[PDB]
Design a protein around this ligand. Sequence first.
Ligand code: HDD
Ligand code: HDD
Ligand SMILES: [Ca+2]
Ligand SMILES: [Ca+2]
Ligand SMILES: [Ca+2]
Lengths: 673, 671, 355
Amino acid sequence: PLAAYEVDDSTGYLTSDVGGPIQDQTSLKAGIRGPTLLEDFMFRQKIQHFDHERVPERAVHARGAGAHGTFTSYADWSNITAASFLNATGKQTPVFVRFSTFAGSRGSADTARDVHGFATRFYTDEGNFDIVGNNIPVFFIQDAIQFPDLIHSVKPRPDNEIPQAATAHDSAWDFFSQQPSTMHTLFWAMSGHGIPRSYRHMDGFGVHTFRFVKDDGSSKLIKWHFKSRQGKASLVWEEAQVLSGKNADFHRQDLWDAIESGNGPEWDVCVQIVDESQAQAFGFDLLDPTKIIPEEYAPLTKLGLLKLDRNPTNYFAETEQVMFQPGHIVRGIDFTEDPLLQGRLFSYLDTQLNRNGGPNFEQLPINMPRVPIHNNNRDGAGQMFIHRNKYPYTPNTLNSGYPRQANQNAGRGFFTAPGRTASGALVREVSPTFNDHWSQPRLFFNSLTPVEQQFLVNAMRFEISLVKSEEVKKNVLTQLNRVSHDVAVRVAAAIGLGAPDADDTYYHNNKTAGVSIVGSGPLPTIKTLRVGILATTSESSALDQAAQLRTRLEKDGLVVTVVAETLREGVDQTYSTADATGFDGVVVVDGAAALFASSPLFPTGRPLQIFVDAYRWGKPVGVCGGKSSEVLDAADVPEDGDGVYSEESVDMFVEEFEKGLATFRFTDRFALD
Amino acid sequence: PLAAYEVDDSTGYLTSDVGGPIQDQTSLKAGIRGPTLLEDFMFRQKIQHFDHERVPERAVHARGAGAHGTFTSYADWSNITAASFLNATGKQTPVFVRFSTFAGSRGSADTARDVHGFATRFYTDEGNFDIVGNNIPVFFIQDAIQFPDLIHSVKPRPDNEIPQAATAHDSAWDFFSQQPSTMHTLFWAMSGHGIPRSYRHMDGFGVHTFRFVKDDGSSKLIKWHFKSRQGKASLVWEEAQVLSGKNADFHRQDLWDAIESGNGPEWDVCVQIVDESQAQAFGFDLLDPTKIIPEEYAPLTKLGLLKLDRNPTNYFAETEQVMFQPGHIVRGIDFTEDPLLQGRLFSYLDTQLNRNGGPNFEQLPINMPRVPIHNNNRDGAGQMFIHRNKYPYTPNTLNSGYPRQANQNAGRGFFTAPGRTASGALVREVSPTFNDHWSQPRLFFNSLTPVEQQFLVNAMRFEISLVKSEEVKKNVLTQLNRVSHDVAVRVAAAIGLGAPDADDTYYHNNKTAGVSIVGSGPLPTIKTLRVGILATTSESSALDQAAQLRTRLEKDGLVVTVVAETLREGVDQTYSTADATGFDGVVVVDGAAALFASSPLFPTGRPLQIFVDAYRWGKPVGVCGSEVLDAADVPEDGDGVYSEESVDMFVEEFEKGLATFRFTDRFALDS
Amino acid sequence: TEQVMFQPGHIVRGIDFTEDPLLQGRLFSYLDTQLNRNGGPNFEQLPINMPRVPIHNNNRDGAGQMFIHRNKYPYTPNTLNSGYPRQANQNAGRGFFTAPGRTASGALVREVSPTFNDHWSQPRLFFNSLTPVEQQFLVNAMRFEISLVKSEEVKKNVLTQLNRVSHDVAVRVAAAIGLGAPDADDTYYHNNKTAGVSIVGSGPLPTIKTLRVGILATTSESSALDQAAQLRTRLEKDGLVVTVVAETLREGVDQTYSTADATGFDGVVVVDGAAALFASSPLFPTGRPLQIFVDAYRWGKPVGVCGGKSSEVLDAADVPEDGDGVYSEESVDMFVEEFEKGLATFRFTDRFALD
Ligand code: HDD
Ligand code: HDD
Ligand SMILES: [Ca+2]
Ligand SMILES: [Ca+2]
Ligand SMILES: [Ca+2]
């Protein structure tokens, strides 16, 4: 896809950047034990390059990972949009997607509790079109001017830069409690959507209302929804924390691996579409980025399929250097007067100057379009083009009036939706239509399962209990209470304050479909899911059972890891490196039962800790071979529990265990208030 | 110390950067539901600043933390060096120190297994002097030109950028096994030195041989050693991994807290001093940065005290922007022909152009000297001075010959040690004197305790089992076996390969003092160490027990956290947020026994897991008030296990255990 | 000077923008372009750019950050820094505020207001307001530049636009470049004038202080230097900058004929003791002394000979004694009094031909 820019070093002699063959292993010296010479250009070119390898990390979403793929349109969508990449059944457009967390710096853990980015570039035949989205459909704030306040509050305290990749400190919760617009996103981040199981098991949302614009100039309002074909799934917090230490790269590795194994993830690219006249028809303002349109009021139209199926060749060149902009817009789409979106337009063009160090960042292979470029932009540091047109001004006669102006009527220009209008004073004021900060957070909460609601309360309990200021904590309970009195009461319990009296202004009982994770049924596929098989070298029997299990499980697309004391034929991982965070389900072969009752080869109690951890975190666990009580009794796991399996028959074991993998989590193991 | 540069925003109205009062909470729009206007300069100035907040992270040592302090000279050292900061008994020089890991990016965890940076700036009355050191006294490679090879191999694989902050992958071990100079630093990194308990519980080393130069021109060869006065301590690996998730900020938080509480860490700044004639006298070449001088051959001389006692005011401005250079040298010190050192001098000047974006990085407050600057450097982006001298060239008459040249005999100039010499062909060749890559790794290994040796084998077992390539794994065994056959046998066992036959060229039995962690006796102080008291709100007796334990422990300078199901008066932390990685010792109060036998307030089994984790990780653990110890399966007769009715008897025992710090009998040994 | 970074966005309370679509865009440009010049976002921290009042805001970090901020809670709204800094606006803290009478209405358009469409009437007003010679100078600048335009079609297109402002201008510029002017097109012609835009019409200068007088002398006669010295004293008293020019430097001589040029002077005086120079030396280029006097005259400057013998200098220069702005007195005092009026007059525009 970027094949034209690739550099092959599978053969040949080392050269400088200017093609002179050289060596690079010993410095030039005055004598064998002498000082290094200034004239050693080999040394200096190589070390200068190294000294300058790094670029500024993104200001937000610094930690992330990307892949190439393809978008395919299901129809000719000319009836609703002029957009070219949507103009034909089966029409294919190359994409590049980067996923990310939000707060953390570029080496922070994938499995922090955070908002996640989901940024998609369509290299369309009428220009690059970016949808720069998140895994959560609403944002914290209602005006782009507040962006640095939010980000300052969420990032580490600036005297000591503590804590990394976390909202669990005074400043973030001070901001949330003083700025109540944040409530809706906060509730999302405190649910399982804050700790998704993988990039593949989350959705993407454009967040803002945009416009679809036909060639005749008429427009409709839309929201983007990228709906996962892998299903929605999350971690539990106490698993996430351990995972952040055991494997900071979990999400990027999961994505890389799924793509390498031929299981590249897929989304349905959907929109909600409503009329301009419905901007305030739903009990809120469609310009307000803190609100969703409940699916009951407007259903998804599936536009096409997004599949990621190709890993990058060089992470830095492709993933680190990709520079998205919501200003990368194409004919057939337009902006709205969402004051959050409005300010983003400025920010993303400006910030790339910081990252790239110069104005020619669109010339980087990953940012280049796949159609010709005709304009009078010139010069700048790092200019890679050699322009032939020596009259780069409009209007001209000396280049015969080229390039020609493009617009609604000619050259398939972008155009602002011609129905759009402005009226009134030039104001720095907030629309009173934006003022209800609480009803939609309550709607979201109502729509979770009882155990899911517990998980969310328990996340707030965790975070707020780490806030040092009593006053901030009181202010936090004040805002929570406006969403739900019960939530305030339950989180106050953990922090030894009293909740304030019920304030019912915004209370209600309504629910909406499609926002719950635990409620979304079993996963539609178990391909790529990870099964750990805990075995031993001390019994040839155990290794036999493991091999039999492997054969049967791998037939169904599961990634099987056999664990034992030491590596050898058929064993993938040692107990020393193994951890429950590494598996979606854990099986002990009964040949290995003795290990679950000391070794220099692994930390004491490791085999049993993996089983106990997996059970406590809600995963399918079991013993295969028929003798289960020694292991289960050691783990305090009840033989009759949901998602606990015990069979002698390998075929029967796997048939039951695979249902448990699709269920994914057994939530009956978590206590409720 | 940087007070002149401080900005106070505790009062006043919001202004732009040019002092015009503004607001910053709502955009300017055409109508109340209208589009944002280009003429909103309040918006654009604020968001432009934010857009440009980030600067490139350091190419290595990107993850770090810093503090201000003071160095105090013990003596007048004029008899060995001309260095002004060492020229009088009791002479004080402000310092700034940054500690770091090595491989990880910004945000990665403090408790990765890694080499650690320990970079010290002395703002002397004769210029800034930097010692840019590590916690390990030898480096991987023997020539600066190999640095990008080492770093590429150790940092994440460049197709997918995995794994973060770790040598546990094919490329690192490919390089190690192909470049055997790496063996000595590798053995250090695979020891407890790879996972120190804090910045305060590690030493600092200059690594290279440098020269001390007297005013009379004569020179001696030296090594810098910063010897911790808190003692040396490490984590265990299985604890460190969890810690990296539970608190990535563990080291920087430990440093911040120690300073805030009046317990700023101290080091004795030391040197080994030897004659120029002894360059090759110790069985290796003093120019070779992969070798130590055993303390048996050359004892340490204490020059003065380094103390850190002041946290920064703004992390970015001070810690992130501090730009160290070994080129920051002062009269009385000189370089050697160490080819690793030689190339560092180029690198650290060049690299600040990347970080700062321009040539005036020395004008940042944290980089400024504390004496006047007189030179003819001019212009450049971000120029902060207004130079009065309009004839900035030498030689001149129009500025009366100023600034004047400084040298050995005038203006206290820096001078290259005058005895230094060069001879021979201009070569890109390695000295044969560098060729022994294995003896000193074996020296180091020999000097560790039996269980220390086991930890190191187990770290290699852990990492090498993750290396996918069979051929790389075999190549690694070939190298380890040249250091020790027994090491190669023991790590080969974990990876299902056969160890190669013993090859005894570099085997020996010698030991050297001062390199072992577990062997270095109990900690000389237990101030700052963390005790978690596990209690319950369901019994008032439990809280009374915890409160009484608190009073007695805090007297002795320990940081006490009382844990229970929920927060209230006397309780610091919930079981939900508590972890054994957060404590140096764990005490259960009798009255809370029931908890160790389910709750919506914390994950199932959390209270007993803390206690069990702590025990298995080697910590002092106890019950104050056998029921608990049974449930935990912790033996009452265990070293570092405590069981006492009386709070006074308990504390007195338990504090002895905190000084011992780790009970290593809890770890299995090979064969 | 090099580092000063101006912005129209540097605005204060009591002033506001208009919807001038040129002004509007400038506001973006000057903030952005400083990133290029400075290489980073902290350009307002350069000494020449700093304000002379306290700065209170939550801008942080960036390359070249020179401040050490004490406020560790730089976000609004906060309680952890007690709500500081406080928002400033019309009603509090002397905030900037957009003029509240300001309003917008209509479609979001990339369209030009028809109110902007007269491009020619005001150029005509400007031209009408210049003096005849001044109009000739303008025509001649156009003649100079347009004759260097190589494309025939461009030159024709230029004549088209010129003709819409003034047919006479089009005809006169066209004569120099060998094309015909298009026929008169009177849509925008008029005879209106406006005050204060003319240079040559704005009367004598109000002060001659700082103006430059070159006195051309010689070392060959000790009387020439005595004359130069008398003139210097008289002229410097009135705050003129006097350069005495001779073949070589010495006490009283400021520069050599070799470095001297008419472009260096607002007026040129020859002391009649130096007449023989105006009639070869290794010390300056052939004919330099006469050339300085001839250039000065032809460029419209006051020129003169002081001492009483003028005819040899004036005749060699083809300058008429009775010319305006040509002076010839024996008396130093009388010479200076006359010459200084010529310096205020500044240029003698009768020396330039009209169409
Ligand atoms: C006005 C400032 C501001 C506001 C209000 C937004 N952000 Fe943004 N965003 C940026 C300022 C910006 C940025 C600082 O300009 C970034 C950082 C790196 C970059 O290229 O743009 C960016 C990064 C960026 C990334 C990473 C892109 C990549 O992977 O390279 C994603 C996914 C988003 N943001 C998503 C959004 C969502 C869904 C928003 C709310 C609807 C949002 N941002 C609000
Ligand atoms: C030729 C390249 C070169 C080589 C051979 C070395 N390094 Fe280095 N080091 C760098 C090039 C580098 C650098 C890339 O230039 C850094 C990164 C950021 C910086 O300011 O300098 C640096 C960072 C740096 C830091 C972080 C300083 C801070 O806290 O800001 C420390 C502590 C060290 N290194 C210490 C060492 C030691 C003890 C070495 C072996 C004796 C050594 N380096 C070899
Ligand atoms: Ca904070
Ligand atoms: Ca690798
Ligand atoms: Ca730059």
